[PDB]
Amino acid sequence: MMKIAILDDYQNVVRGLNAFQCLQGHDVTVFNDSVSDETVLIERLKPFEALVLIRERTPITENLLAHLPNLKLISQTGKVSNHIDVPLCERYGVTVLEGIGSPVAPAELCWSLILAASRHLPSYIEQLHAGHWQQNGGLGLGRTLSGRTLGIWGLGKIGQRIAQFGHVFGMPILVWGSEASRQKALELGYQAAADKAEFFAKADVLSLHLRLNDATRGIVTKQDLLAMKPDSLFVNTSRAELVESGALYSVMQANPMRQAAVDVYENEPALPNNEPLLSLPNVLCAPHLGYVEKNSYEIYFQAAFENVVKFAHS
Template sequence: MKKHVVLYKSLSPALRERLGEHAEITEITQLGGDGLARLRDALPHAHGLLGASLRLDAALLDLAPRLEAVASVSVGVDNYDLAYLDRRAILLSNTPDVLTETTADTGFALILGTARRVVELASMVRAGEWTRNVGPAQFGSDVHGKTLGIIGMGRIGEALAQRGHFGFGMPVIYHSRNPKPAVDARFNARHASLEQLLAEADFVCMTLPLTAATERMIGAREFALMKPSAIFVNIARGKVVDEAALIAALQSGQLHAAGLDVFEKEPLAADSPLLRLDNVVATPHIGSATVETREAMARCAVDNLIEALAGRRPANLVNPQAWAARGR
């Protein structure tokens, strides 16, 4: 008898068919409206869950006594209570690697778009306000040769460093828990304290995961350490930044500009002060949002779930403690 999977993320026909070969599927196309109620009704029968962007807390997962595995279509796992999953020996998998290059592309798009004021000036043209050659009031900032500071040197941080070093001749400095000699050698990069990086970097880019240690890692103190000409870019998670402090720094001119793909609360509220600032480029969490990458992420998640429900360790297991708890 096939195991039961609750799917709360749209899959391509080919991937849905592949999953259906291994499991019975209850599909919930939208979590809005009565979707969450339908999810609750389906959980008692679920052996597996596949989806993203839903906070799976104990109150929900207590409704799923048969649950064996959760396949998240994401790299970040801050929506999951790992301690709870470990206690119940529920395997959690994610989708690293496949979105690295696409997310780094997004980061560099924000660097370029913010430095060269692309959104602001394109809006001026669209509004019919381009009536003469641009002058100093519309000038942007160079990117080539400027110092790129990366906070969090994981896969995405390395991909960003590659673009900056090889593509734009940017000196690279980074802050992470430990130096990475291979990164230093490949990109002529330098490991630095957070304070050193903030003081030296022309572009400060966040690429680290959200954890208890990184939540609100960047606040008023950190913005005060940056150059007034610095540009801040966040492709990590919104909550690694104190958003109120970021707004204050941008409004006061303490910080030159920001390129943001993530926010404390998403979707970003229409009355957010960030949307009234010309020195902000804001995108709707599009880090991995390309046709090719989202399909690759979904394929990875499907493969992870099939393996887990077959009693095999998935390739992208997040919580090996749960696997150990099964006596494997």
């Protein structure tokens, strides 16, 4: 019925979902690489009548829209976000359909990074397979989250789940942000940090859960990072651009006593050749794996593909 491109399925896993059967009858091409040039992208996507987007992996610009005359439908996995403007699409004769957000998989993934980093898990496992029992490349002993203070900035849906995890794991919860967020924190029985200085100085584990906008861009300074404890764990599963550019790498390089766990980067795909954080033994780097999960996918693509079907019948 329609020519459909599915973009940025890096792992080639979309075809393996039960949800994929929803696209029976359509002429479907799944792309699995990452095009940096919009000129190249436009030529590639010219034939297609519908696009299925994977979250924010490809931004939909006016230049993109204006040069895809066959495009009738963009079907978005989850809610439309910063990477897509619906009114703009419609002016170009493109319907945008969307799904719903889900905080479950990202929250779980964030906790996994925190536990892994705190116990030096990747290093210990790699060394086990290298033939060195219970070594981790000189990182020393791992530590419990119990009795350690969990610092949380964004107190949204994901931020609240992480705070719940921390509490049940025996962590004092310290919150910083707007007064409204800190008030919510206090009502939930958590602590509110007196200021940004005290927040960064007191957190043993510090996790960011803020949406990126003009108020939040570079809101975490190098100065903030440098005020953290010498054995602190900094966690960013939200957006790398919340942090002053190159500030994370600089601080982590200077102090092998401290650690960080990240899921997001300034440029993605982030690879050893373009991302200096990947060269540091005290930084745990994950490949934007927050929403990349079996249930998350099935839910995302069930909605996205049904939307294609709904549109196909319209």
